[PDB]
Every structure is written in structure tokens, then in C-alpha cells.
A paper describes a structure:
TAPL is a homodimeric half-transporter composed of a transmembrane domain (TMD) and a cytoplasmic nucleotide-binding domain (NBD) with an N-terminal TMD (TMD0).
The final map has a resolution of 3.2 Å, allowing accurate modeling of the Mg2+/ADP·BeF3 complex and side chain conformations. The structure represents the typical outward-facing shape of ABC transporters, in which the two NBDs come close together and the TM helices have a very wide opening towards the lysosomal lumen (~36 Å in the longest diameter), while they are tightly packed on the cytosolic side. As a consequence, ΔTMD0 forms a V-shaped substrate transport pathway open not only to the lysosomal lumen but also laterally to the membrane luminal leaflet. Consequently, the central cavity is completely isolated from solvent, thus probably preventing the expelled substrate from re-entering. In the NBD region, the two ADP·BeF3 molecules are sandwiched between the two NBDs.
Residue numbers in the entry:
A (entry chain B), B (entry chain A): 168 to 739
Write the structure that this text describes.
């Protein structure tokens, strides 16, 4: 990220910066002409008396005071309304581009980092670019009103004052280019300190079962002391700067004296060579500010926003473009010679030449020895990850060709460890849908057998299950995750191992009777119990990522194909 | 939180502040005396030849310039250092008091709120305090100088200049009591929009299975447009305080003319009356800054830190004070007429008069109908929540009387949904322990039947399982959550649902063998499968929070007690 780019996100704020600059000029006139009009007013009363021409002249002293404060106020009241509008736009423009990246991206960036860039960084970058544009607009007017006088007093001497500027910028640039490399290693070393404060608070019930809850507060400290060594290095590099300029503004302050002598004796007056200094002390208090800091800050902002400007430009490595949304779907899924391997461990192949299909209207189970690729057959059916070789078909057309917002409304899912949100229940069984009538939420909460325990909570369908449904039992959090996938009435239904993983051994049956036997679905039951997969219309045993057997329970329990060995210890 | 409290947290910086103030005094002295010596040197060099006589006077100008530059640089450096130190101290002192609160606390405050608070509020408070202290010191020095110069001219008029200061303060106190009530409803409405950006990023694999990943980015926006409506009322005020001040500083400039002229025609030189204004213009620019902003800011800091100063003073409602660490623990647990009720739903009793015990060296199981209180018998045994009637005894003495860091080293636990951390595996099977030898991590990873699949990962025991072990299968995250509980040799082991959860029924046994049959443990197997509790030395069936049956498998399958009805559907 260069300096031009950072100033591009402030383009829609020109209508505000001009009205903020104009009201800045008017604030300068009233600050200079005031004395000239004051004496002109004091002489009036001094001529004869007051109350006769005083009011005639004292008026122009009031209007300037009033006419001034209005400007100095309406200005400060807009450079605080452009630090917000620039913030809200830098924040929103990141999220909206941080929530459309392929899923393989959230496995490499810990959710503590991604929030330290959205919360902290975009607050810094917004801050710097406000002040340093609040200043460079003030010091570009004072330098003008003070530069014209340094000519009226001297035509020669002024041309020497302007020989330091090109010097006070070669220095104000050497730090701008070093203050960036640093203010990026502080926003970074400050995020790594905010991924240990989020990983320890979100898991406080498992960091306390072990007694090191007060020792995980000394791994946070030792993460700040590394954001300190980066702060006592950002001071020594700002002290060392003030000296770098101050010295330079001295040489120009001396050389102006000696060369100011030759004139004072021969050419220039002695009264002028003294006033051209007072008016000269300002161009130093400006040549060091106007372009000393305004170009360091603008180079410390571009440092803080060096990463925030990378998540906004990153191109998702899996783009979904297709609008094949039909109106009559059968529900026939097929895996045609699949081959898969994750992006965070690319030396092991998860699936290999897997090939099977689900028939429309039948409960095709899927089993395996707890380490084969079973869920990975769900993280693909739902187009989370890309394939190396092969294609998944849904009714004859590869899933890549369906409308990304429609495919996920005809393929429900019950992930292995269901994750609920911190809302009500009636607002959690209808998560993805716009305003479904409260009638269909109950008609779909009796199928999953939730209405039994929901109508006993302190508040019924309006209770709360906060922070990943951690305020519901392990068995109630599924029957509320089941109902969340049935209220859509989906043709294809996917029940991952959370089907009945944590039920009472009598509840999982009262669901099977109603899940797909009554209506027409295409279920896909992944599980380890022999009960659930007993009556399945089919079974696909896969081991180490290779489909082995495809046969019904008895038709497969006859021959020994690694299936009859699994259910052995369970048949008692 | 008053202002004295906010300032108290900067007590250990008195040394730095006195050093900064001293260097500020020096810088002011230099900047004020420079022109007089400059004129002296110019006169001394113009009187005679300046070639050799100039230096004897320009040396003083050079020394004053060098001194001023050094002072300004050191002041800037020390203020940046003080800001950094204050920020670090506040940050650290928040966490260390935010990770020792009772567990119920973390069930009422969402983990996005806490992190937004910590980060943003600490940054804002430190920034405000630093800027404001700096400005106040500078302005007090300048005001002292100018007030001396003003008294030197008039003894009467000055006493009218100060008649406005109390006015410009009573006004700078009404935008310090309204600007606090506001800057607290911005930090408390900007952290309510950083819990919708953390709840959506940490659950990105379940907010995408439903297609509303780009509609969850328009619930974030509408959470910012309410931080705007506040950031606007915060501008329309600052723009309405400069006016309330600028005006008051006008009446003082008018009233200083009427009384200013009356003295110029009778007893005050007209030359002086003109000069007592220029010096007067640069007190309005200070009486409006020195106490204008420096007392609004200090009242906006106390606003932003209105909550951060509440998590630092909150008293944990469950304090553990007991040191009874023995050297020979038997391992006998007992529940003596327990009665329990959560604090976030205090109208339903979870447990009721529960009473049972675990015998030292026996696998006491525990079962129920998926909604009774079973885990709540573990969130109590580990002293997470307080009881209401009854005691939980560990070897005769209540658990409340054990070293909180020792009790949790003799009672291991396997939560219902295990949660791993984003580290290696050899650094995750030894979480709570300091540097256990790598020989004991393998000897304890073969018991849990994990060494089989660990030595096939791309990197072996050094691979990574990031962000809640989401980069391991559902059945590999259990066998790594067991090894984490067995590497301590706990005399009391608790398996909420670890083996039965997601194991393939083959490695399901190899754990069931070596866990407690070889050594001396006191296991407690919670589960739903008939396999675990089949060979258990005891069973305790509890329903709706009331222990019903306490008998072995056969001794309990004889009499129908809601047990024979549970395992019925699975006995095949
Ligand atoms: N997000 C992921 N990134 C990398 N590897 C993964 C990820 N999820 C699972 N794996 C690996 O894939 C293999 C098979 O995983 P998975 O298909 O989930 O097994 P199961 O379906 O039995 O849970 C496992 O060895 C696991 O280490
Ligand atoms: N943290 C919590 N806060 C409030 N209520 C809870 C919490 N955890 C569980 N519950 C409630 O307690 C009841 C019993 O929960 P629990 O004992 O966990 O059941 P199980 O042991 O079968 O999972 C449930 O109805 C559940 O709603
Ligand atoms: F390891 Be699994 F999700 F059966
Ligand atoms: F509802 Be549970 F944890 F058996
Ligand atoms: Mg799975
Ligand atoms: Mg439980």
C-alpha cells in the first residue's frame, strides 16, 4: 500500500474537505486583520471620545470575532465528521470483503487476529489520516500569510529561508520511510497479543478445569512486553527526529544572521533585519510541522493499514458463479471418481477415487472407522472446498453450476458438532429464512422432537442459548439443530454424525419415524451406532478414503467386508 | 468512575511527568528569551565589524536554540513513553481481573463484548489522558508567561481579563458532563457491533452452510450506522462549544475596550492600551484551551473508561480460599443431598436431593434420559458453580477446602464437546503441566489409542490443530482430549462423553481396557451407549434431577426401572 492508495478511500469526502477548507480561510483572515482593525478602532475613541465613533468602528471588531469563531467552530465540527465517515467506510469495506473468502482461508487466520485488524487497525488508520489532514490544511495558510511579509521586508533574505525546506524534507522523509516499517510491526505484534486474549476467554470453561487460568494471564503479559520494545523504539525515533530538524532550523537561523549583517550595514535597515526574524521564527515552527509531521503521520498511517489494505484486495481463490436454480429438483446426488486433499496439509490424500450415489427418496447411510473420509464427503457435497480430480453431481449438473444462494436452500446439513447462535430459540430454528410464520416453526420442532423440552424452559420458545448454545444440554443442542434443518423442508437432507450422537437411546427412534419416512427426502445418515444405520436402504463402507462395500445391512453382514467386524462388539 | 480515580492509574509515572514538566519549563524559557538576545547580538554586531565580534554574541543564540530543541525532543519522547506505559498497565490490569471471575459471569457477557472493551476502551482512554495532560502542561506554562507580561503593563485591566475565566470554565464544565454521558454510549454501542463480527467469523463454516453469509454483513452495517448517529451528536456539540467559548471571549474583548479607552484619555498611554490587547489575544487562545479542552477530554476519558473501571473492581461472587493439598489421596467422592440451580435461569431446579458416591477403584457409571442433570453433576464436582443445599465431599472433606490449583490436578475431565487449542499436539496433550518429558506424552498417548493416527500426520507430534481442533476429525479430537487427561495420572477421572461420543467401536474398546482396569483410578463414565455401562461396577440412573436406581447391569435389568426401557431399543 502506497500513500496515494490510502488517500483514495477519502475521495467521497471532497464535498466535505472543500467546505472544511473554505471555512478555514475565513478563520485566518479574522485572525490577521483583527489588530489592524483594532488600532484603527482605538484611534477613533482616542481622537475625541468614546460612544460616538467607537461603536462605528468597534462593530468591525465584533463581526471579525463572531465571523471568526463560526469558522473555527464549523471546521473542527467537520474534521470530526470526516474521521467517522472514513472509519465506517473502512470498517464496512473490510468485513464485506472478509466474509466472502474461501473456507480454506479461515483455517489459516485465527479469529483473534482477524478482529484485531477490524477493531483496532481501522481505528488507528482512521485517526492518523484525520489529524494529519487537519494540520497540513492549517499550515498551508499560515505559511502564506507569513511568506508574503518575508518578501515585503526582504527580496534577498527570503530566498535563503527557502533553502532549508528541501533539507527539512529529506529528513522528514527518512523517518516517514522508517516510521512505516515500524508502525506495521506494532499493529502485528499487537494482534498476536489479542489472539491469546480471545482464545482464553472463549474457552474459559476448559482453561479452568485445569488450574492454569492465572498462568494464562502471564502468557498475555509476555505478549504485551513485546509490544513495548516496539514502543520504546518508536519514541527514540521521534525524539531523534525533533533534534534532526531543530538543528537544521538553527543553521538556517544563523546563516540568515551573517548574510543579514552585510545588508544591515550597507543595504538593508537595522529595524528590518530584526523583524525579518520574528516573522522568521514561524516558518520554522511551520516548515517542521506543515511537512515534518504531516508527511510522517501519513507514512505511519500507511503502515498501520498495510494489512487492512490486503484483506480488501485479496481475491477469493474459489469464486462461485452459476444461476441454474430450477423449480423441480429430484434429489439425486452422485460422486464420480472423486479425489480430495486439503490445502493446509497437502501431502495426504483424504479421498481417493470415491464413487457412489444417493437414490431419490431413500436413506443412504455411510459408515467407516472413525478416521476415514466421512465428513470430508460433506465438506465437498456442500461446495466448501475444491476437488483435485472428479466431480460431484446433483441431479445431473455439477454443484458448481447452481445458484450459491439456492443450492444451500435445497441441501440442509447437521454438522458434526452443531453450533447454535446467541439468540432466542424461535429465532434460531429459522436462521437462514426471512420471517417464517411461527406456525411452521412448531410444526417443524415436533418432528425433531424439540417441542417437548422447549415448552418447559423458563420462557418457552423465547428463551436464550448464548455463545454457541452453551446454555443448553448436549442433547437439547442437537434437537434444536435438527429442527433448524427441517423448517426449510429440503429435498436433500444431510445428517452428519450429530444425528443421534448424544440422544437418550429412545429419542433417536422417535425422530427416524418422521424424518424421511413420512415425506420425500434424500437422507444421508453418517453415524457409528448400529441402530440408526440398521434399516438404511443402502450402506457405503469406506476406509482410509476408498469405498469398500455397498450393500444393505443383512446383505452386507453375510460377507465379512470390515462391516461385520465393526458392529460385532455392539451386537449383544 | 470519577476523575480522581482515572488519574490515580498514572501515579507510577510521577517521575516521568516531573521530568517532562522540567524539560517543558526549559523549552519555554529558551523560546521566550531567544528574541531579546537575538536583538542584543544584532546590535553588538552592527555597532562594529561583525566578522570577528559577531560570534561572541551569536554563541548565546546558538546555545538557546540547541537547548530549546533538546527540551522539545525529550518532552515528546517522554510523553509517548508514558502513554505506552499507561496503556500497557491498564490492559494488563484488566485481563488479570477478567479471568478470575466465577464461571456464571462468562455466561452473561458475550466474548466479543469483553474483547472489544479491553482493546478499544484501553486504547482510547490512554490516548485521551496522554494528549490532555500534555496540552494542559504546555498551556499552563504559556499562560504564566503571558500573565506576567500582562500584569507588567496594566494593574487594573488584567483584573477584568480574569473575570471571564470562571465563565469559560462553567461552560467547559457543561460540555464535560454531557460529553461523558455520550462517550460511554459510543464505546457501549461500538462493542455491540464487535460481537456480530466475532460471532460470524468464529462460526464461518456454519454461517455458510446456509447462504446468508452476505446478509450477515448487512446486520453488521446496521450496527455501525448506530455508532454514526452517536458520532454525529458528538460533532454538533464540539461545534457548539467553540461558539459558546468564542462568544464569551468576545464580551471580554469588548468590555476591555470601554474600560480600556476611559483609561487611555485620563491615565493610560495609548501605546500601552494597544499592546495589552496583543498579549490579551493569546490568553483567550489559552483560557479556551488550557481549561477548555483539557477538562473536556479528561471527562471523555472517564467516559470511555466507565466500564473498564468496573471489570477491574468487580468482586468474584465465588472466591476459593482453601489450602488442604494432601500427599496421599484415596479418591472417594460423595454427593450428600445436593440441590442445584443455575444463575441464568433461577426458576428451574436442575438437581434435587441427589445423593450417591463413587467407590475408590471402581468404574461407577451414570446414565439418564438426555435431559436430566448429568453434566451438571460434573460442573459441580469440579467447583464451577455453587450449591444451594448439600455438600460434595472428596475423601471426607468438602471440595471447597482444597487448593484450587491442586484439586484440578487430581480430578481430570473430558468435557462433553472437547475443545482443543491452536497449538501442536505434543504441546496440547501436556496443556496444564510444566514441561513434561516427551517420554510420558507417548506413554500416555498409547493408552488413549492416539499414537496410531498421530504418527501418520504430515508432521507427527508437531502438527497443528487450530482454532478448537477444527483441523482434526471428530474422532481424533476425542482421543487427543483423553490423552490430555491421562498424562497426569489423576486419582479421579471423569469421562463426560469421550469414548462413546464419536469412536468407531473398534478403538472404542482398546481405550475401555487400559484406562482404569490396570491402574488405580476412580472413573465416572457418563454415556448413552449400552457398551460402556455394561461392565461398570455400578450404575446410577437419574431422571429430571432425582437419582432413581443404583444397581449393576444385570441386577438392574431384572427390575424395570426406566433403565431396561432405555437399553431396550439397542439390545439387538
Ligand atoms: N480442515 C481440515 N484441514 C486439514 N485436515 C483435515 C481437516 N479436517 C479433517 N482433516 C483431516 O482429514 C482426515 C479425515 O478427516 P475427516 O474426513 O473429517 O474424518 P472423519 O470424517 O472420520 O471425521 C483426518 O486425518 C484429519 O486429520
Ligand atoms: N450453563 C447453563 N445455564 C443455564 N441452564 C443450563 C446450563 N447448562 C445446562 N442448563 C440446563 O440444565 C438442564 C439440564 O442440563 P444438563 O444437566 O447439562 O443436561 P445433560 O447433563 O443431560 O446435558 C437443561 O434443561 C439445560 O437447559
Ligand atoms: F472421525 Be468421524 F467425523 F466418524
Ligand atoms: F443431555 Be446430556 F449431556 F446426556
Ligand atoms: Mg465427521
Ligand atoms: Mg452432558
Amino acid at each position: 500500500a502506497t500513500l496515494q492508495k490510502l488517500l483514495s478511500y477519502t475521495k467521497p469526502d471532497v464535498a466535505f474537505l472543500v467546505a472544511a477548507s473554505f471555512f478555514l480561510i475565513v478563520a485566518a483572515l479574522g485572525e490577521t486583520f483583527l489588530p489592524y482593525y483594532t488600532g484603527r478602532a482605538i484611534d477613533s475613541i482616542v481622537i475625541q471620545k468614546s460612544m460616538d465613533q467607537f461603536t462605528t468602528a468597534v462593530v468591525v471588531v465584533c463581526l471579525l470575532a463572531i465571523g471568526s469563531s463560526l469558522a473555527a467552530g464549523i471546521r473542527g465540527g467537520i474534521f470530526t465528521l470526516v474521521f467517522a465517515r472514513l472509519n465506517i467506510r473502512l470498517r464496512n469495506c473490510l468485513f464485506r470483503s472478509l466474509v466472502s473468502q474461501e473456507t480454506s482461508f479461515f483455517d489459516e487466520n485465527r479469529t483473534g487476529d482477524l478482529i484485531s485488524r477490524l477493531t483496532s487497525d481501522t481505528t488507528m488508520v482512521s485517526d492518523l489520516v484525520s489529524q494529519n489532514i487537519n494540520i497540513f490544511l492549517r499550515n498551508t495558510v499560515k505559511v502564506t500569510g507569513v511568506v508574503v511579509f518575508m518578501f515585503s521586508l526582504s527580496w534577498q533574505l527570503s530566498l535563503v529561508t527557502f533553502m532549508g525546506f528541501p533539507i527539512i524534507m529529506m529528513v522528514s522523509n527518512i523517518y516517514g520511510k522508517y516510521y512505516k516499517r515500524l508502525s506495521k510491526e506494532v499493529q502485528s505484534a499487537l494482534a498476536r497479543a489479542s489472539t491469546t486474549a480471545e482464545e482464553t476467554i472463549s474457552a474459559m470453561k476448559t482453561v479452568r478445569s485445569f488450574a492454569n487460568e492465572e498462568e494464562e494471564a502471564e502468557v498475555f503479559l509476555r505478549k504485551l512486553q513485546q509490544v513495548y520494545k516496539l514502543n520504546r523504539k518508536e519514541a527514540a525515533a521521534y525524539m531523534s527526529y525533533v533534534w534532526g530538524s531543530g538543528l537544521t532550523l538553527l543553521v538556517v537561523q544563523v546563516s540568515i544572521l551573517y548574510y543579514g549583517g552585510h545588508l544591515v550595514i550597507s543595504g538593508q535597515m537595522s529595524s528590518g533585519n530584526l523583524i525579518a526574524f520574528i516573522i522568521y521564527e514561524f516558518v520554522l515552527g511551520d516548515c517542521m510541522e506543515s511537512v515534518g509531521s504531516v508527511y510522517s503521520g501519513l507514512m505511519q498511517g500507511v503502515g498501520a493499514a498495510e494489512k487492512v489494505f490486503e484483506f480488501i484486495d485479496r481475491q477469493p481463490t474459489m469464486v462461485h458463479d452459476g444461476s441454474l436454480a430450477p423449480d423441480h429438483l429430484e434429489g439425486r446426488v452422485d460422486f464420480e471418481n472423486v479425489t480430495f486433499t486439503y490445502r493446509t496439509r497437502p501431502h495426504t490424500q483424504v479421498l481417493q477415487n470415491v464413487s457412489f450415489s444417493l437414490s431419490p427418496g431413500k436413506v443412504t447411510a455411510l459408515v467407516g472407522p472413525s478416521g476415514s473420509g466421512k465428513s470430508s464427503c460433506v465438506n465437498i457435497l456442500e461446495n466448501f472446498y475444491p476437488l483435485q480430480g472428479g466431480r460431484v453431481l446433483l441431479d445431473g449438473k455439477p454443484i458448481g453450476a447452481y445458484d450459491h444462494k439456492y443450492l444451500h436452500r435445497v441441501i440442509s446439513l447437521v454438522s458434526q458438532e452443531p453450533v447454535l447462535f446467541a439468540r432466542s430459540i424461535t429465532d434460531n430454528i429459522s436462521y437462514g429464512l426471512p420471517t417464517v410464520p411461527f406456525e411452521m416453526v412448531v410444526e417443524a420442532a415436533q418432528k425433531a422432537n424439540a417441542h417437548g423440552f422447549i415448552m418447559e424452559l423458563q420462557d418457552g420458545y423465547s428463551t436464550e442459548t448464548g455463545e454457541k448454545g452453551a446454555q443448553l444440554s448436549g442433547g437439547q443442542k442437537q434437537r434444536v439443530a435438527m429442527a433448524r434443518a427441517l423448517v426449510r423442508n429440503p429435498p436433500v437432507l444431510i445428517l452428519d454424525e450429530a444425528t443421534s450422537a448424544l440422544d437418550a437411546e429412545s429419542e433417536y427412534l422417535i425422530q427416524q419415524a418422521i424424518h424421511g419416512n413420512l415425506q420425500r427426502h434424500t437422507v444421508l445418515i453418517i453415524a457409528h451406532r448400529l441402530s440408526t444405520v440398521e434399516r438404511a436402504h443402502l450402506i457405503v463402507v469406506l476406509d482410509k478414503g476408498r469405498v469398500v462395500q455397498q450393500g444393505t445391512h443383512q446383505q452386507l453382514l453375510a460377507q465379512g467386508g470390515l462391516y461385520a467386524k465393526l458392529v460385532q462388539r455392539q451386537m449383544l
